[PDB]
Amino acid sequence: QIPASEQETLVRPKPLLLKLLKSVGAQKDTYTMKEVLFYLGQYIMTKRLYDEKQQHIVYCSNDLLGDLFGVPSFSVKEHRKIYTMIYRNLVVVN
């Protein structure tokens, strides 16, 4: 869904995305997009934000993730939509 070149893009999360990443063990100040997505997956999984049955549906209206993304819920199958939301929360480095 997302070209490898884009997944490999180097980025610097803005402070609130950063603090969220670090809350699930992230150790750096910059990341590839692939790494950002990896840690956001850890966040969603460990906080159990996904629907019990249709586990690709994420509910975030009672979480800081909803504030960061600007939505109450989303589907994890929509990778471009997710990337678009994440780019509003970081600065591209390279």
Ligand SMILES: CN(C)CCCN(C)[C@H]1CCN(C(=O)c2[nH]c3cc(Cl)ccc3c2-c2c(-c3ccccc3)ncn2Cc2ccc(Cl)cc2CO)C1
């Ligand atoms: C409850 N289960 C269904 C969870 C299973 C979790 N998976 C083992 C991990 C494997 C790597 N994963 C993630 O990196 C991974 N990272 C994410 C970051 C965001 Cl913002 C949203 C979803 C994911 C996510 C993921 C999920 C997922 C994650 C948690 C709960 C429910 C489902 N299911 C497929 N993926 C893969 C995926 C979805 C969207 C996008 Cl843009 C990028 C990628 C990366 O391929 C999911």
Ligand SMILES: [Cl-]
């Ligand atoms: Cl990815």
Ligand SMILES: [Cl-]
């Ligand atoms: Cl990588």
Ligand SMILES: [Cl-]
């Ligand atoms: Cl998927």
